[PDB]
Each structure stands twice: as structure tokens, then as C-alpha cells.
Design a protein around this ligand. Structure first.
Ligand code: BEF
Ligand SMILES: [Mg+2]
Lengths: 16, 116
């Protein structure tokens, strides 16, 4: 269940 | 900018150090597990840390928590195979500023160094 880097960039922004 | 590279894999530490220096940063030191990472962070006081998750002795999450205690303004980029949503959330909650999943492309390391 590993996310993509775009998935992560997205998730990081969400988290800020 | 002085970087501490944390990862238990000799090859990864080798390739990260190569990317960081060629991007104009200074490699301050390396650590091979979470306890050493906290130990080196205290000793070296780097500007930036790159952090693996899966390591013997003490994982990246706990090392993040340990470095944040030593220094609330520590700047830590995770670089790990453990790219699940719950791990990204946990690493960001613990105080990391960025997260790069392995395998990664080298430009993403560069932008992460810049960002911090
Ligand atoms: F060992 Be890692 F968390 F890629
Ligand atoms: Mg590892």
C-alpha cells in the first residue's frame, strides 16, 4: 500500500 | 548547508552523499540507525538531516522524535521504502518536513534540501 511521490507531495501540502 | 545522512544501508548512504555534495551541500556525517542519528545530531548540529525509517535498534520515527527534542527547529527529510499513507502521516506528525519514497529520482532530493 505504498503511495506515489505526487500522492505524497499532495499529502504533505494537505498536512500544512 | 551541512547535511547528516541517516540510513542503515551502506549503498544508500553512499548514493545520497554523492547527490548532496554534487548539489552544492556539505555532507556533515552519517549515521546507521536511530540512536546513532540522535548521537550524531547532538555532536554535529547539522542544518539538515536525511532520515531512513526501517533501521536496526531504533527506527526513523523514534529518531525524528529524539532529534526534535534535542532541537525543536531540526529540519528532517525522510527518505524511505515505507511510503504508506500511515507512515507519511506518522513521520510528518513526529516533525519531518518532507518525505521521499524509495526508489526515488535524485532531483526530488535536491528540491527537498532547498525547501528546508
Ligand atoms: F529502510 Be527504509 F525505511 F527505506
Ligand atoms: Mg533501512
Amino acid at each position: 500500500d505504498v503511495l506515489s511521490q505526487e500522492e505524497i507531495n499532495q499529502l504533505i501540502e494537505a498536512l500544512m | 548547508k551541512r547535511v547528516l545522512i541517516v540510513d542503515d544501508a551502506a549503498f544508500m548512504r553512499m548514493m545520497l552523499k554523492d547527490i548532496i555534495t554534487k548539489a552544492g551541500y556539505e555532507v556533515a556525517g552519517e549515521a546507521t540507525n536511530g540512536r546513532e542519528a540522535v548521537e550524531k545530531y547532538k555532536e554535529l548540529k547539522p542544518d539538515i538531516v536525511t532520515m531512513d525509517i526501517t533501521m536496526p535498534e531504533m527506527n526513523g520515527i523514534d529518531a525524528i522524535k529524539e532529534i526534535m527534542k534535542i532541537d525543536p527547529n531540526a529540519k528532517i527529510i525522510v527518505c524511505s521504502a515505507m511510503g504508506q499513507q500511515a507512515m507519511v502521516i506518522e513521520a510528518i506528525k513526529a516533525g519531518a518536513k518532507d518525505f521521499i519514497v524509495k526508489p526515488f529520482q535524485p532531483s526530488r532530493v535536491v528540491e527537498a534540501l532547498n525547501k528546508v
